[PDB]
Each structure stands twice: as C-alpha cells, then as structure tokens.
Amino acid sequence: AFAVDAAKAYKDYLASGGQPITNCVKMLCTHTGTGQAITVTPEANMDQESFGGASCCLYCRCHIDHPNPKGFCDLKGKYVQIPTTCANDPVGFTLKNTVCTVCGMWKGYGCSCDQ
Amino acid sequence: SSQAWQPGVAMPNLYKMQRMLLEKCDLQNYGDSATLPKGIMMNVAKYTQLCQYLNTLTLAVPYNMRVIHFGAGSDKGVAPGTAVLRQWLPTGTLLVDSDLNDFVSDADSTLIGDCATVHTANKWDLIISDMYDPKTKNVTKENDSKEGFFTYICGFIQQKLALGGSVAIKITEHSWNADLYKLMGHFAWWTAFVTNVNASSSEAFLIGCNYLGKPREQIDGYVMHANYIFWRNTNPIQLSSYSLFDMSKFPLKLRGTAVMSLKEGQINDMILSLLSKGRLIIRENNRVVISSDVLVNN
Ligand SMILES: Nc1ncnc2c1ncn2[C@@H]1O[C@H](CSc2ccc(Cl)c(C(=O)O)c2)[C@@H](O)[C@H]1O
Ligand SMILES: [Zn+2]
Ligand SMILES: [Zn+2]
C-alpha cells in the first residue's frame, strides 16, 4: 500500500516557505494566443506565459513515476500556459489546478463555463 | 548596423573565399551581454534566433519530417533548445534528442549517452547539434582540428542525412573540425551563422543547406576555419535581442516537400537541381527506429 506522494510533499514544502522549482523553460511567443491551458504550440495570451511542458511537470522534473496506470504525462511534448502572476512556480500551478474539459482553459483562470 | 534587427549575422561570401592563416580570436565585444526579455534563458533566445535564420533558407520540409538534436541537455536537467525546435517545427514532426547526461525533454524520444552510442535505422531531414567540450578552450596550446564528437557527426551526416536535408552544427574558435568544414562543400550552400544574442562569443552554427551527397566544391577546412576567425576578428557584431520580440512569423513553413526513394544511379543533374532548391528529399519513408549502445561491465 506504500506509495511516495510527491504532490503532497511539494505542496507541503511550498506551504512551509520553500523556494519553488526553478528552470522551467519559458518560451518566446506573441502573447496573442488562445489562452488555453495545455496546447501543441505556445498559446499564451497577454495575461500568461508559455512554458515547455516537460519542464513544468513535477514527475518529469523529480524523475518519478507518473501517478496513473499507464505512466503517461499530460505535459511532456506540449506547452503549458501559466498566468503571469503565478509564473514564479509553474510546477506548483499545474499540480494545484484543473483544466476545463469543454473549453480547455484553466478552471478559475480563464474558464467562463459557469458564469 | 541594420544587422541588429536580424536574428544574427551569416559569414559573408567574400570571407569564405580568402586564404587566411589561423589567428587567436579576439572579439571587440567580448564579455558584453545582450539584454534578454524578462525571464528568458540564453538557450531559448539562441535557438529562437537560429530558427529565425533557418526560416530564411531553402529548407526541405516534408510531411512526417524527421529531426534529430544532439547535445540537447542542460546542467539544469531540461532541454530548452528542444523546446524551441518543437515550437518551430510543424506539428507532427518527429523530433529525437540526445545528450551524455540525463535530462527531461519534450522530444518524441530521448537517448542518454555519448553521441557515438546513438544508431538510427532511418535517415533524417535536419540535424541540429549544440555539443561542445569546454576543455577545448585551451588558449595555451595550438588550435588544431578536434575529433571526439565531430568524428561521429561527420559520419552521421554522410550515412544518415537524407539528400536534400540540412544541418546546423555548433562550432567555436577552439571547438571545430576540418572535415566538417570540408563536408559543407557537399551541400548546395553553407554558412557560419552567429546569433545576435550570443555575438560576444566565438560560437557559430555551421549550416549546410540541402545535402547533395557529393562534393559540389572542394573546401580546405583548416583554411576555412581561419577565414571564419578572420571574419569574426574584423567584424564586431552588436549584441541584440530585437528579433526575439516579433514571433508572429516564427513557425517553419509546412512545404509538403516531396520524398522519393532513389538509388545512387538515378541522381541526375535534374534531381541534383531539385535537391539544391529545397524541393526534394531522398530517403526511405519507413518507420523511425533508434537505439543507444550499452556497454555492459562489472
Ligand atoms: N560527445 C557527446 N555526446 C553527447 N553529448 C555531448 C557530447 N559532448 C557534449 N555533449 C553535451 O552537449 C551539451 C551542450 S555542451 C555544453 C555543456 C556545458 C556548458 Cl557550460 C556549455 C557552454 O559553455 O555553453 C556547453 C551538454 O549537455 C553536453 O553534455
Ligand atoms: Zn511528466
Ligand atoms: Zn470551461
């Protein structure tokens, strides 16, 4: 039943005042993109930064298994859009947030499906 | 310099035609640095400018394009150059990268180990290398042609680059190889390209544009490297990040370049002319299979 819980460990590390994971790969882009969360090319809008996906994945960066049966990664080989106000910690942002399955935007950071 | 709004500066043709003796590289703007956009790493800026320059050349861009990237890791364990290449290349392009040291990457497949351990069944349309051994920078001994990974790269080009394909191979004042310059004469065109963000370094990318598989011109690589250093020594390049701010036309144009299988006896001058124009790739279109040799010991 033992499993390492890296997500909880990083969240607890952050809450205790630890410095976020660095060297996430920030892309140059127009910042006139769709703003969707996870895309095949950078899609940051004026309020976002775009990052290489593998570098923003806790499991990729920590060299640990991805937490699903197939071990598949939702970020590697893609680009992740991070709100500029949260771009100091892209790994923590992707860990803590969810993508709306109908509009593709971050819940609470672009998804307007509930208004 | 109008050059400051370009992504970088290519070695002018007249400098390629000289017969200079090799001198020490002494850059006027040595130690200066470009102001990068907030939070952007040098490696992202450098690869972005390389790709912007490659956008100006007659690259063959087929469907199911195949690109391999050597030296793709960083001491931070990520692959910023691979991330730029994946942004640049058409969606669906197969991108493989490799480094001596482990790293995590956005490439479709990644091989860890010395480049000499890398073997591929297939040929490639574009080869990018950033490999560099910092031990070459020994200002106290003669600057001779280097081997090491350059020997691998030269054989890899001759054996696994599709006709019509292109390369961009990093060199510096001390990290260079005479046979690699000689191989530039086996392309329809070649240059040494300096990014504007890293213009304070003797780094350049040796670019071979549209591979022909035979010598089009005879190049003495010892002379050509001396010519390159002479150009750098007498032409200071103003550091510049200007081109990083306009990405609206960044993606590589999906050209649909024809891919054909031909045996060496059907490459006539009409085929050679299509290859030279970026209009044809010659290789099989089978499955892409790669491997890394593992040395087993106690
Ligand atoms: N034979 C070989 N096979 C496979 N990979 C190889 C290789 N030789 C080098 N590399 C790899 O190329 C990458 C870029 S080289 C480099 C490293 C550190 C610095 Cl600090 C600088 C700099 O000064 O900018 C440049 C490195 O990640 C190295 O691991
Ligand atoms: Zn991952
Ligand atoms: Zn939504």
Swiss-Prot record, chain A:
It comes from the Viruses. It is found in: Host cytoplasm, Host perinuclear region; Host cytoplasm; Host endoplasmic reticulum. The lineage of its organism: Viruses, Riboviria, Orthornavirae, Pisuviricota, Pisoniviricetes. Zn(2+) 7 binds at C57, C60, H66, C73. This is Non-structural protein 10. The chain holds residues 4271 to 4385 of 4405 of the full protein. Residues 1-115 form the ExoN/MTase coactivator domain. Forms a dodecamer and interacts with nsp14 and nsp16; these interactions enhance nsp14 and nsp16 enzymatic activities. Plays a pivotal role in viral transcription by stimulating both nsp14 3'-5' exoribonuclease and nsp16 2'-O-methyltransferase activities. Therefore plays an essential role in viral mRNAs cap methylation. Zn(2+) 8 binds at C100, C103, C111, C113.
UniProtKB/Swiss-Prot annotation, chain B:
It is found in: Host nucleus; Host cytoplasm. The active site is at K46, D130, K170, E203. It comes from the Viruses. Residues 2-296 form the Nidovirus-type SAM-dependent 2'-O-MTase domain. It catalyses: a 5'-end (N(7)-methyl 5'-triphosphoguanosine)-ribonucleoside in mRNA + S-adenosyl-L-methionine = a 5'-end (N(7)-methyl 5'-triphosphoguanosine)-(2'-O-methyl-ribonucleoside) in mRNA + S-adenosyl-L-homocysteine + H(+). LRR repeats lie at residues 19-43. Changing K170A: Complete loss of virus replication in human respiratory cells. Methyltransferase that mediates mRNA cap 2'-O-ribose methylation to the 5'-cap structure of viral mRNAs. N7-methyl guanosine cap is a prerequisite for binding of nsp16. Therefore, it plays an essential role in cap methylation of viral mRNAs, which is essential to evade the immune system, especially when restricted by human IFIT1 and IFIT3. May disrupt host mRNA splicing in nucleus by interacting with pre-mRNA Recognition Domains of the U1 and U2 snRNAs. Interacts with nsp10. This is 2'-O-methyltransferase nsp16. The lineage of its organism: Viruses, Riboviria, Orthornavirae, Pisuviricota, Pisoniviricetes. The chain holds residues 6799 to 7096 of 7096 of the full protein.
